[PDB]
Design a protein around this motif. Structure first.
Motif, PDB file in Angstrom:
ATOM      1  N   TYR A 132      12.781  44.487 -17.217  1.00 40.25           N
ATOM      2  CA  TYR A 132      11.573  45.121 -17.413  1.00 40.25           C
ATOM      3  C   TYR A 132      11.796  46.458 -17.079  1.00 40.25           C
ATOM      4  O   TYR A 132      12.054  46.790 -16.008  1.00 40.25           O
ATOM      5  N   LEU A 133      11.458  47.449 -18.080  1.00 41.20           N
ATOM      6  CA  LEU A 133      11.418  49.021 -17.747  1.00 41.20           C
ATOM      7  C   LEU A 133      10.191  49.175 -17.022  1.00 41.20           C
ATOM      8  O   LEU A 133       8.823  49.038 -17.386  1.00 41.20           O
ATOM      9  N   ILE A 134      10.300  49.858 -15.841  1.00 40.83           N
ATOM     10  CA  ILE A 134       9.405  50.692 -14.729  1.00 40.83           C
ATOM     11  C   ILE A 134       9.440  51.950 -15.335  1.00 40.83           C
ATOM     12  O   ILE A 134      10.206  52.754 -14.587  1.00 40.83           O
ATOM     13  N   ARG A 135       8.364  52.543 -15.839  1.00 39.58           N
ATOM     14  CA  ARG A 135       8.103  53.919 -16.149  1.00 39.58           C
ATOM     15  C   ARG A 135       7.654  54.545 -14.873  1.00 39.58           C
ATOM     16  O   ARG A 135       6.710  54.095 -13.920  1.00 39.58           O
ATOM     17  N   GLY A 184       2.688  61.004 -10.013  1.00 44.25           N
ATOM     18  CA  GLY A 184       2.625  59.958  -9.129  1.00 44.25           C
ATOM     19  C   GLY A 184       2.229  58.581  -9.910  1.00 44.25           C
ATOM     20  O   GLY A 184       1.627  58.550 -10.758  1.00 44.25           O
ATOM     21  N   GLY A 185       3.169  57.488  -9.409  1.00 42.12           N
ATOM     22  CA  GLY A 185       2.698  56.160  -9.754  1.00 42.12           C
ATOM     23  C   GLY A 185       3.865  55.353 -10.722  1.00 42.12           C
ATOM     24  O   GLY A 185       4.616  56.262 -11.353  1.00 42.12           O
ATOM     25  N   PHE A 186       3.694  54.242 -11.010  1.00 40.37           N
ATOM     26  CA  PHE A 186       4.443  53.230 -11.781  1.00 40.37           C
ATOM     27  C   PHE A 186       4.013  52.307 -12.551  1.00 40.37           C
ATOM     28  O   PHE A 186       3.056  51.830 -12.059  1.00 40.37           O
ATOM     29  N   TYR A 187       4.530  51.849 -13.644  1.00 37.77           N
ATOM     30  CA  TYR A 187       4.004  50.846 -14.185  1.00 37.77           C
ATOM     31  C   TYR A 187       5.058  50.377 -15.293  1.00 37.77           C
ATOM     32  O   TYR A 187       6.082  50.915 -15.705  1.00 37.77           O
ATOM     33  N   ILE A 188       4.772  48.930 -15.609  1.00 37.71           N
ATOM     34  CA  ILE A 188       5.351  48.333 -16.919  1.00 37.71           C
ATOM     35  C   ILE A 188       4.689  48.655 -18.153  1.00 37.71           C
ATOM     36  O   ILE A 188       5.182  48.833 -19.025  1.00 37.71           O
ATOM     37  N   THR A 189       3.445  48.476 -17.885  1.00 38.27           N
ATOM     38  CA  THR A 189       2.300  48.648 -18.944  1.00 38.27           C
ATOM     39  C   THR A 189       1.497  49.809 -18.281  1.00 38.27           C
ATOM     40  O   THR A 189       1.084  49.650 -17.035  1.00 38.27           O
ATOM     41  N   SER A 190       1.049  50.971 -19.014  1.00 39.28           N
ATOM     42  CA  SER A 190       0.432  51.912 -18.435  1.00 39.28           C
ATOM     43  C   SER A 190      -1.123  51.371 -18.071  1.00 39.28           C
ATOM     44  O   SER A 190      -1.907  52.295 -17.320  1.00 39.28           O
ATOM     45  N   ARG A 191      -1.494  50.363 -18.735  1.00 34.21           N
ATOM     46  CA  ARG A 191      -2.619  49.603 -18.128  1.00 34.21           C
ATOM     47  C   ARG A 191      -2.890  49.258 -16.912  1.00 34.21           C
ATOM     48  O   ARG A 191      -3.835  49.142 -16.345  1.00 34.21           O
ATOM     49  N   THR A 192      -1.634  48.917 -16.298  1.00 34.30           N
ATOM     50  CA  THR A 192      -1.664  48.389 -14.780  1.00 34.30           C
ATOM     51  C   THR A 192      -0.765  49.265 -14.087  1.00 34.30           C
ATOM     52  O   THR A 192       0.500  48.685 -14.175  1.00 34.30           O
ATOM     53  N   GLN A 193      -1.078  50.182 -13.355  1.00 38.42           N
ATOM     54  CA  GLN A 193      -0.497  51.097 -12.695  1.00 38.42           C
ATOM     55  C   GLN A 193      -0.688  50.984 -11.271  1.00 38.42           C
ATOM     56  O   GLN A 193      -1.548  50.650 -10.544  1.00 38.42           O
ATOM     57  N   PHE A 194       0.566  51.553 -10.505  1.00 38.62           N
ATOM     58  CA  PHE A 194       0.988  51.249  -9.027  1.00 38.62           C
ATOM     59  C   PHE A 194       0.945  52.652  -8.369  1.00 38.62           C
ATOM     60  O   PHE A 194       1.839  53.433  -9.100  1.00 38.62           O
ATOM     61  N   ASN A 195       0.887  52.686  -7.100  1.00 36.89           N
ATOM     62  CA  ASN A 195       1.156  53.936  -6.437  1.00 36.89           C
ATOM     63  C   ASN A 195       2.789  54.015  -5.881  1.00 36.89           C
ATOM     64  O   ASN A 195       3.177  54.784  -5.498  1.00 36.89           O
ATOM     65  N   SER A 196       3.357  52.658  -5.930  1.00 37.38           N
ATOM     66  CA  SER A 196       4.548  52.776  -5.333  1.00 37.38           C
ATOM     67  C   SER A 196       5.227  51.440  -6.158  1.00 37.38           C
ATOM     68  O   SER A 196       4.628  50.621  -6.607  1.00 37.38           O
ATOM     69  N   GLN A 211       4.331  48.447  -4.113  1.00 36.99           N
ATOM     70  CA  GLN A 211       3.187  47.672  -4.723  1.00 36.99           C
ATOM     71  C   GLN A 211       3.089  46.985  -6.077  1.00 36.99           C
ATOM     72  O   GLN A 211       2.707  45.927  -6.228  1.00 36.99           O
ATOM     73  N   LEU A 212       4.079  47.644  -6.830  1.00 39.42           N
ATOM     74  CA  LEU A 212       4.187  46.811  -8.146  1.00 39.42           C
ATOM     75  C   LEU A 212       5.042  45.362  -7.830  1.00 39.42           C
ATOM     76  O   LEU A 212       4.650  44.458  -8.557  1.00 39.42           O
ATOM     77  N   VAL A 213       5.969  45.555  -6.970  1.00 40.53           N
ATOM     78  CA  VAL A 213       6.642  44.298  -6.588  1.00 40.53           C
ATOM     79  C   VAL A 213       5.688  43.352  -6.128  1.00 40.53           C
ATOM     80  O   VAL A 213       5.616  42.106  -6.512  1.00 40.53           O
ATOM     81  N   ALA A 214       4.917  43.747  -5.018  1.00 44.12           N
ATOM     82  CA  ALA A 214       3.779  42.887  -4.345  1.00 44.12           C
ATOM     83  C   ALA A 214       3.034  42.276  -5.464  1.00 44.12           C
ATOM     84  O   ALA A 214       2.619  40.913  -5.478  1.00 44.12           O
ATOM     85  N   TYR A 215       2.457  42.836  -6.507  1.00 41.58           N
ATOM     86  CA  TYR A 215       1.492  42.563  -7.495  1.00 41.58           C
ATOM     87  C   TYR A 215       2.212  41.349  -8.410  1.00 41.58           C
ATOM     88  O   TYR A 215       1.548  40.420  -8.778  1.00 41.58           O
ATOM     89  N   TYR A 216       3.199  41.816  -9.042  1.00 40.55           N
ATOM     90  CA  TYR A 216       4.000  40.869  -9.710  1.00 40.55           C
ATOM     91  C   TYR A 216       4.642  39.645  -8.982  1.00 40.55           C
ATOM     92  O   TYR A 216       5.193  38.490  -9.736  1.00 40.55           O
ATOM     93  N   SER A 217       4.478  39.612  -7.632  1.00 35.74           N
ATOM     94  CA  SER A 217       4.989  38.441  -6.839  1.00 35.74           C
ATOM     95  C   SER A 217       3.822  37.468  -6.688  1.00 35.74           C
ATOM     96  O   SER A 217       4.414  36.256  -6.558  1.00 35.74           O
TER      97      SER A 217
END
Length: 108
Positions: free
Chosen positions: A62-65, A70-82, A85-91
């Protein structure tokens, strides 16, 4: 703190190398790592083991943009500060991925 300290962050490994690691039959479904993208400069990739109904053991990528603001997402709808945090969420829940993140890819 820096992404470089996280045991799931493998940096500049190839997609081929990520597959070699993730396709270990011992890895539980949802075994994962994060790497730099080979295709999109400055993006990351989340590489995740899966068991596909038709293809058996396979890896999803999965591409992480990454936003210059600042910020990261696989989808622009669900964005993370790091990435952390993205890892934690999808975990916690798949939320659109093949499977939730369950296991940090054993090293190599």
């Amino acid at each position: 703190d820096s992404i470089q300290a996280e045991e799931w962050y493998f940096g500049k490994i190839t997609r081929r190398e990520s597959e070699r690691l993730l396709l270990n039959a011992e890895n539980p479904r949802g075994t994962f790592l994060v790497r730099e993208s080979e295709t999109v400069k400055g993006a990351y990739a989340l590489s995740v083991s899966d068991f596909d109904n038709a293809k058996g053991l396979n890896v999803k990528h999965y591409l992480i943009r990454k936003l210059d603001s600042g910020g990261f997402y696989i989808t622009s709808r669900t964005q993370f500060n790091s990435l952390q945090q993205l890892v934690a969420y999808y975990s916690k829940h798949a939320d659109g991925l093949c499977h939730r993140l369950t296991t940090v890819c054993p090293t190599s």
